[PDB]
C-alpha cells in the first residue's frame, strides 16, 4: 500500500475484512394448491378427436412428475422452450387437449405435417410451442365387441386452420345436383373407430394428450412448484424469502407483526425483519460483521 520497502513507525490503514457466507437458504411459501390433473390424466372416458376437449388448467401448482412414474409416457416431444425454463414463466389460462386416436398417427400430430387428421380433424401451427405425449390404452380403451364411441372427421370441403373445432353434422356434397339425405354421392362426414384389444401395435388406440399448452401471459401467473430447503439460524447465510434476496444472520425476534404483513423496514430502507412463510415466525436479519484490518508496526 505504501509503495515502499521502508515502513516507518505508526498505524497504517490497509484492506478490509468481511465474514463470507457459508450456506444458502431458500424458503418459498407452503406448497398447498396444485391441480389434480388426476382428473385430466386418470379419467375413465375421453373425447373424440373431432370433438376434442380443450381442457382448462388453472389456479394451481404444476406437479406432473408423478405422472412420469405412474404413467410411462412413451411419447414426449416438446417443440417450444426447454422444460428447464418452465420455472421462469408459468401459466394461468393454459389450455390442454385430450385425444383418442389410432397408433400410426402420433407422427401426424407434429408441426408442418400432413394427412387426414392433420388436415380435417386437428391442425397445429408451424410455430407450435407445446409437448405431445401419447401412451397405449389397450387395457382401458379397447373392447372385444368394439369401442364404437370415438369418432373422427373424414370429409370436408375445405382445409382447417390452427386451433379450430368443428361439430357440424350436415351431409357432404360431392356432385352438382342439390342434396337431401344420403343415397347417391352424398356421404355422412362422421365415421367411428373399431378398437379391439387384439389389434396390432399400429392400430391399437393411443390416449394422446397433445399438450398444445401455452397461454402463459395473464394478469395472474399460477406457477410451477418451487423447492424449499431447511432453515439455519445464528449463522451467516445467503437467504431468499419470496424473492427478497440478501445475506446475513437470522435470529429470533419479538416484533409483533400484523397478520397481513410480510417484511419489515427500518428508518431508511433496509430489510431489518422478515417473516418465514411456513412456520410464521418473526426473524430478525442482522448484517455480517465487517470492518478494517489495520496494522501496527514499530
Ligand X SMILES: *[C@@H]1O[C@H](CO)[C@@H](O)[C@H](O)[C@H]1NC(C)=O
In the range 81-100, which residues lie near ligand X by CB under 6 A?
Answer: 98
- Return the one option of ligand X, another protein, none that residue 218 interacts with (CB less than 5 to 8 A, by type): another protein
**260 contacts another protein (rule: CB under 8 A):** yes
Is residue 273 within 8 Å of residue 238, measured between CB atoms? no
Please, which residue, 221 or 279, has the CB nearer to another protein?
A: 221
- Residues 74, 96: Cα–Cα separation, whole Å: 19
The H or E element spanning position 141 is helix 138-141
Q: Closest approach of Cβ 271 to another protein, in Å?
A: 9
Is residue 214 within 8 Å of residue 246, measured between CB atoms? no
- How many CA atoms, within 13 angstroms, populate the side-chain half-sphere of residue 195? 26
> What is the DSSP code (8-state) at residue 80?
S
- Residue 86, phi then psi, degrees to nearest 5: -65, -20
- Residues 164, 152: Cα–Cα separation, whole Å: 14
- Residues 216, 29: Cα–Cα separation, whole Å: 22
**45 contacts ligand X (rule: CB under 6 A):** yes
- Return the one option of another protein, ligand X, none that residue 263 interacts with (CB less than 5 to 8 A, by type): another protein
The residue count for binding ligand X (CB under 6 A) is 14
Mask of contacts with another protein, 6-45, x by CB under 8 A? Answer: ----------------------------------------
- Residues 118, 250: Cα–Cα separation, whole Å: 58
- Residues 284, 298: Cα–Cα separation, whole Å: 43
- Return the one option of ligand X, another protein, none that residue 93 interacts with (CB less than 5 to 8 A, by type): another protein
- Residues 203, 137: Cα–Cα separation, whole Å: 11
- Residues 75, 71: Cα–Cα separation, whole Å: 11
Distance from chain centroid for Cα 33: 14
Q: Which of 60, 71, 90, 232 binds ligand X (CB under 6 A)?
A: 71
Q: Closest approach of Cβ 67 to ligand X, in Å?
A: 7
In the range 200-259, which residues lie near ligand X by CB under 6 A?
Answer: 256
Q: Which of 258, 290, 296, 297 binds another protein (CB under 8 A)?
A: 258
Residue of 297, 140, 266, 143 whose CA lies nearest to 206: 140
Q: Which of 28, 60, 93, 111 binds another protein (CB under 8 A)?
A: 93
Distance from chain centroid for Cα 95: 11
- Residue 39, phi then psi, degrees to nearest 5: -70, -20
**78 contacts ligand X (rule: CB under 6 A):** no
Please, which residue, 258 or 296, has the CB nearer to ligand X?
A: 258
**286 contacts ligand X (rule: CB under 6 A):** no
Q: Which of 26, 34, 35, 53 binds ligand X (CB under 6 A)?
A: 53
- Name the closest residue to ligand X (Cβ): 98
Q: Which of 30, 229, 261, 286 binds ligand X (CB under 6 A)?
A: 30
Q: Closest approach of Cβ 183 to ligand X, in Å?
A: 30
Is residue 65 within 8 Å of residue 177, measured between CB atoms? no
Q: Which of 62, 109, 132, 273 binds another protein (CB under 8 A)?
A: 273
Interface contacts to ligand X, rule CB under 6 A = 30-31, 42-43, 45-47, 53, 55, 70-71, 98, 256, 278
The residues that touch another protein, with contacts defined as CB under 8 A, are: 58, 92-93, 218-221, 255-258, 260-265, 267, 273
Amino acid at each position: 500500500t505504501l509503495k515502499s520497502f521502508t515502513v516507518e513507525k505508526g498505524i497504517y490503514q490497509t484492506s478490509n475484512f468481511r465474514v463470507q457466507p457459508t450456506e444458502s437458504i431458500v424458503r418459498f411459501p407452503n406448497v398447498t394448491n396444485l391441480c389434480p390433473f388426476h382428473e385430466v390424466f386418470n379419467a375413465t372416458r375421453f373425447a373424440s378427436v373431432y370433438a376434442w376437449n380443450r381442457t382448462r388448467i388453472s389456479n394451481c401448482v404444476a406437479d406432473y412428475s408423478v405422472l412420469y412414474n405412474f404413467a410411462p409416457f412413451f411419447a414426449f416431444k416438446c417443440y417450444g422452450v426447454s422444460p428447464t425454463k418452465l420455472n421462469d414463466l408459468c401459466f394461468t389460462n393454459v389450455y390442454a387437449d385430450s385425444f383418442v386416436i389410432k397408433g400410426n398417427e402420433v407422427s401426424q400430430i407434429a408441426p408442418g405435417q400432413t394427412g387426414n387428421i392433420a388436415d380435417y380433424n386437428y391442425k397445429l401451427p408451424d410455430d407450435f410451442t407445446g409437448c405431445v405425449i401419447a401412451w397405449n390404452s389397450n387395457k382401458l380403451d379397447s373392447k372385444h365387441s368394439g369401442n364404437y364411441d370415438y369418432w373422427y372427421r373424414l370429409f370436408r370441403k375445405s382445409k382447417l386452420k390452427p386451433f379450430e373445432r368443428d361439430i357440424s353434422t350436415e351431409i357432404y356434397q360431392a356432385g352438382n345436383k342439390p342434396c337431401k339425405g344420403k343415397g347417391p354421392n352424398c356421404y355422412f362426414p362422421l365415421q367411428s373407430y373399431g378398437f379391439r384389444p387384439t389389434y396390432g401395435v399400429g392400430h391399437q388406440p393411443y390416449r394422446v394428450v397433445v399438450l398444445s399448452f401455452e397461454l402463459l401471459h395473464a394478469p395472474a401467473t399460477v406457477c410451477g412448484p418451487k423447492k424449499s430447503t431447511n432453515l439455519v439460524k445464528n449463522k451467516c447465510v445467503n437467504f431468499n424469502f419470496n424473492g427478497l434476496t440478501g445475506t446475513g444472520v437470522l435470529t429470533k425476534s419479538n416484533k409483533k407483526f400484523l397478520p397481513f404483513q410480510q417484511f419489515g423496514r427500518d428508518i431508511v430502507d433496509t430489510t431489518d425483519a422478515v417473516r418465514d412463510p411456513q412456520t410464521l415466525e418473526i426473524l430478525d436479519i442482522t448484517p455480517c460483521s465487517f470492518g478494517g484490518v489495520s496494522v501496527i508496526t514499530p
